[PDB]
Curated annotation (Swiss-Prot), chains A, B:
Gene3D superfamilies: Dihydrodipicolinate Reductase, domain 2, NAD(P)-binding Rossmann-like Domain. One of its GO terms (molecular function) is diaminopimelate dehydrogenase activity. Homodimer. It comes from the Bacteria. This is Meso-diaminopimelate D-dehydrogenase. Optimum pH is about 9.8 for the oxidative deamination of meso-diaminopimelate and 7.9 for the reductive amination of L-2-amino-6-oxopimelate. Its EC number is 1.4.1.16. The enzyme is also inhibited by L-cysteine, and by p-chloromercuribenzoate, iodoacetic acid and HgCl(2) in vitro. Belongs to the diaminopimelate dehydrogenase family. Substrate binds at residues 90, 120, 144, 150-151, 169, 195, 244, 270. It comes from Corynebacterium glutamicum (strain ATCC 13032 / DSM 20300 / JCM 1318 / BCRC 11384 / CCUG 27702 / LMG 3730 / NBRC 12168 / NCIMB 10025 / NRRL B-2784 / 534).
Length: 320, 320
């Protein structure tokens, strides 16, 4: 009855999303939260992150939901000392090193570390690899969105006189249809997406701002940008969500015959879906260590059935 | 090391596609073809299927491209004795059994057999699994076509007195939409697809071919079926292409938020894509064997990176 004993390290949006979804898992028990703050908006027990050493045996897997930017790279390796570990670290350029270092740690403690799960990296990585592997010579693209970009939203905000603001990254529909036909080979980043800004600001300032936006080097110049100055009420009512999604499109030619494989995600709420993967890869981590494996692995190294709470035979009988 | 030695068994549409596509691979050498027929139009060496026996020592893996309806079930298991094998076996209700017997033959000879690969079963099965696992509470549907079903076409053709035949599968566009809006629940493939038959045969035989068709165990029973007896000309001109494809749709709700996972295939030539998938799993099979495994496995049981001609470090560096 496994009830694989889990805990959460870090209590932000993600951390909250994991907490809430564990109730819908048949086989997991939440043993509590490890936090750097004493007092959280919650009934699950809270512990001091420094005291993780002491709880070592109440826990099977630790979901690491702290920051990618600086926390993960430094804190994560020590945690693999105490249990299996799953993270959603999204810095592509650092993955190889993160894994290498996560690898020396987990191996020495005999734990299993799953790194860089989520939707991208995660689901979209898997799909990229599958479709590219299949379609020998192939053309591949990843579009993001439609969804929230915190980095672009932050740039907007630093603008003088902007009160509240958000920017969405949308895929250029033209650009999708073209990739679908194997014709998007010579297209730049400025052509593949479009940006849609929603700004709350005094009417006196609209012209300067809109100008400040469309000329913003590196963040905004070069794109199709659409700008809306909205009431604070419509802002709060409609632009307080965290949606996102994307497309992985791969094409290949087999001698005069085209094939297109498209993977699409539509998420009403980013950290909820990200929690969903992370949780599924947590179950896989536990099963992997149960089979005597150890070290760090990416989502590319785990057989699919491992994420499932159903028994293999049942999966083979119904879904194959 | 290094170049995998490979052979085809069954030289029909699939077998020809696999022939064509092996050229596109960097790490495979096609050693020959094993056929029940003496004269094949190809420059590849051909062999008597009764002679596999003698080539066991110089092939690392055998692609089984005989008919699922009748050939696979008794023939396959005997191939497992001589090398790794890879099939695209399609009778869902008979897969677990197939796997058992293939496992036994494989495990005995120390080989690896990969069963039921292709797109459905194959890629569609994998997608079904990742999505239902990730999203705890979900609704999931699959839709095939409009396109030409290879298994269904080969089935019709094994009915005595059928000179020529082809079958098209037609999905219900309405169902497809309700699905996208999480509203088609409690609907099945059998109620969402129509089966269309184009047949060439003497009018005298019409009565009994129609009976055999509509009473064809789970290849045809339970579906709405249409039988069209047409002139050879009309058939030879109007029914020549082999397109197909479909959609796997899954919808789920986290605490009051929705997510949709969509997987799509648009294939210009059915055998060509199927062949490309069968090939990548062939690479996986050979690797698992060197890696020390043996026995029969489903597509749910192989880590994605095993299908790729690239090194894992590169895959991780570039695609994750
Ligand atoms: N791979 C993927 O597809 C995806 C990956 N991610 C990754 O998820 C990571 C975490 O995201 P997210 O949860 O949204 O980030 P947050 O900023 O919400 O929280 C991160 C950390 O901040 C601390 N913290 C949170 N709230 C407060 C607060 N009010 N005051 C003080 N400290 C606080 C928490 O640590 P403590 O509890 O110790 O205070 C927490 O672990 C990101 O770095 C991201 O890259 C996200 C989506 C997708
Ligand atoms: N899992 C998946 O997604 C997919 C699986 N499939 C499977 O692939 C299978 C093969 O389909 P396909 O290649 O279209 O079928 P064919 O009718 O072309 O061939 C089947 C066998 O018939 C024999 N054959 C071929 N041509 C002739 C001929 N002219 N006269 C007499 N015998 C001949 C060949 O054996 P021999 O050389 O020994 O005579 C061949 O192996 C199907 O059963 C289908 O299930 C197809 C698509 C997808």
């Amino acid at each position: 009855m496994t009830n694989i004993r889990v805990a959460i390290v870090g209590y932000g949006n993600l951390g909250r999303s994991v907490e809430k979804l564990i109730a819908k898992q048949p086989d997991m028990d939440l043993v509590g939260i490890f936090s750097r703050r004493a007092t959280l908006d919650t009934k699950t027990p809270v512990f001091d992150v420094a005291d993780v050493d002491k709880h070592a045996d109440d826990v099977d897997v630790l979901f690491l939901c702290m920051g990618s930017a600086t926390d993960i790279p430094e804190q994560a390796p020590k945690f693999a000392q105490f249990a299996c570990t799953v993270d959603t670290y999204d810095n592509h350029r650092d993955i190889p090193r993160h894994r290498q270092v996560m690898n020396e740690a987990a191996t020495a403690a005999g734990n299993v570390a799953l790194v860089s799960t989520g939707w991208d990296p995660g689901m979209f990585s898997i799909n990229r690899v599958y479709a590219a592997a299949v379609l020998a010579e192939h053309q591949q693209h990843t579009f993001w969105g439609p969804g929230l970009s915190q980095g672009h939203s932050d740039a907007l905000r630093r603008i003088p006189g902007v009160q509240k603001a958000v920017q969405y990254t949308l895929p250029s529909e033209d650009a999708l249809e073209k990739a679908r036909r194997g014709e998007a080979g010579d297209l730049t980043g400025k052509q593949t997406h479009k940006r849609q800004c929603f700004v709350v600001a005094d009417a006196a300032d609209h012209e300067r701002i809109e100008n400040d936006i469309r000329t913003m080097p590196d963040y905004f110049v070069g794109y199709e940008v659409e700008v809306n100055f909205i009431d604070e009420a419509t802002f709060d009512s409609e632009h307080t969500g965290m949606p996102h999604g994307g497309h992985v499109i791969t094409t290949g030619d087999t001698g005069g015959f085209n094939h297109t494989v498209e993977y699409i995600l539509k998420l009403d709420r980013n950290p909820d879906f990200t929690a969903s993967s992370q949780i599924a890869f947590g179950r896989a981590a536990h099963r992997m260590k149960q089979q005597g494996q150890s070290g760090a692995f990416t989502v590319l190294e785990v057989a699919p059935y491992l994420l499932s709470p159903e028994n293999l035979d049942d999966l083979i009988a119904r879904d194959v």
